[PDB]
């Protein structure tokens, strides 16, 4: 897309710079990694 109440999610909406969604996906991945390691060790 970059290769040229308001916003929406989960579709090709041609939104502006979407770094927030990428940031949230990164954060979820990191948290999941932590919980996975802890559960396996426990």
From Swiss-Prot:
Residue ranges crossing the lipid bilayer per the database entry: 22-38
Record localization: Cell membrane
Family: Belongs to the ABC transporter superfamily. ABCC family. Conjugate transporter (TC 3.A.1.208) subfamily.
Subunit note: Forms an heterooctamer with KCNJ11; four ABCC8/SUR1 molecules interact with one KCNJ11 homotetramer.
General function of this protein: Regulator subunit of pancreatic ATP-sensitive potassium channel (KATP), playing a major role in the regulation of insulin release. In pancreatic cells, it forms KATP channels with KCNJ11; KCNJ11 forms the channel pore while ABCC8 is required for activation and regulation.
Protein name from the UniProt record: ATP-binding cassette sub-family C member 8
Taxonomic source organism: Cricetus cricetus (Black-bellied hamster)
Residues of the full protein shown: 1040 to 1088 of 1582
């Amino acid at each position: 897309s970059a290769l040229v109440c308001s916003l929406s999610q989960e579709c090709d909406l041609d939104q502006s710079v979407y770094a927030m969604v990428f940031t949230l996906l990164c954060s979820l991945g990191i948290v999941l990694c932590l919980v996975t390691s802890v559960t396996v060790e426990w």
